[PDB]
Symmetry: C2
Subunit: 190 residues, 2 copies
Amino acid sequence: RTFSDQTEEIMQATYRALREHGYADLTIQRIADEYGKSTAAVHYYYDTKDDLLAAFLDYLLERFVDSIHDVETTDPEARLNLLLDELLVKPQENPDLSVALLEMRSQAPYKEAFSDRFRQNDEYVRYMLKAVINHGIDEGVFTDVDAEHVTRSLLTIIDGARTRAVMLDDTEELETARQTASEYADAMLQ
Amino acid sequence: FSDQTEEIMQATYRALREHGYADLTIQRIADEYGKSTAAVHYYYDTKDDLLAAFLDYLLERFVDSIHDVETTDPEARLNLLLDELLVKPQENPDLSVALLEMRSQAPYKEAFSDRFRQNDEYVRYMLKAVINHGIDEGVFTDVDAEHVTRSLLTIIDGARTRAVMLDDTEELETARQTASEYADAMLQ
Ligand SMILES: [Cl-]
């Protein structure tokens, strides 16, 4: 009841503190400064920067999961697009979080908690993308093709865009990748 | 002269693949090299001076490799460039991890950003050149060569990222297929 309230306020502080300082220079302390409470009011829930950010990843996935539950369209063509929009147009307003997330991704081979977490995100996207592709194949709207490989392909495009958008400090990279995603999909499916 | 620098580039190659970028200092490189901390300082003042050099050392053995593809046949050349970008790096996976770490630093060091950006320029130039040639030759559809090219770059970059993040070099294999699926959907 009041455990969720603190977690959420703390996740928000985290977001804000990551937006300002990036991954490397994040500290519980700076998190705490953004939370407005004592440093020990965060150590009450998390013992480490790393524990805290594993939670923060889980948090971003839930936020993402929520917004998808918002899309109830079952039309395969319309739903693919809406998912692609969700993954490629919406993030054209989180660029400062984006630097932090690439730093953290580059650290996945040294930290299981992050690696586990990023695979989790990836699986969720994979599941929801393969699912709409399968539905359309079933409705006969899409050509009967290797669904696992088509969705792996869209996964690569997605991850391409996120890296190049930060690596090149250009959110246009997602906008071009959005187009790549449509071209790719249309060539395979329709 | 430039003989000694190469051995340092090669030392930081060993210490990179061992200890990682994050856990990398002059002392550790000095160790793989066999000479004193001062002796590497003779060639590089900052660790940043060293890493920048380090960077454009890789992106230099690489162009050395592409400037081996001598063919002007557009279909063949484009596949051979895509091979070199996606098929060869599979057998050389060790450095990919630190490669990603440097990339994540690009927003913090202009020296890094500058270099990946120039490298990216060059890869885009060489990919787009084939595509253009193939259009003139009439063997690829007249296409937005700038977009098709950067589309191929999105695929290549996602592959590099995904292969370390999900710890799976076959991630480059499926991207090679994606790239061929895309290119010839656009071009042919
Ligand atoms: Cl997401």
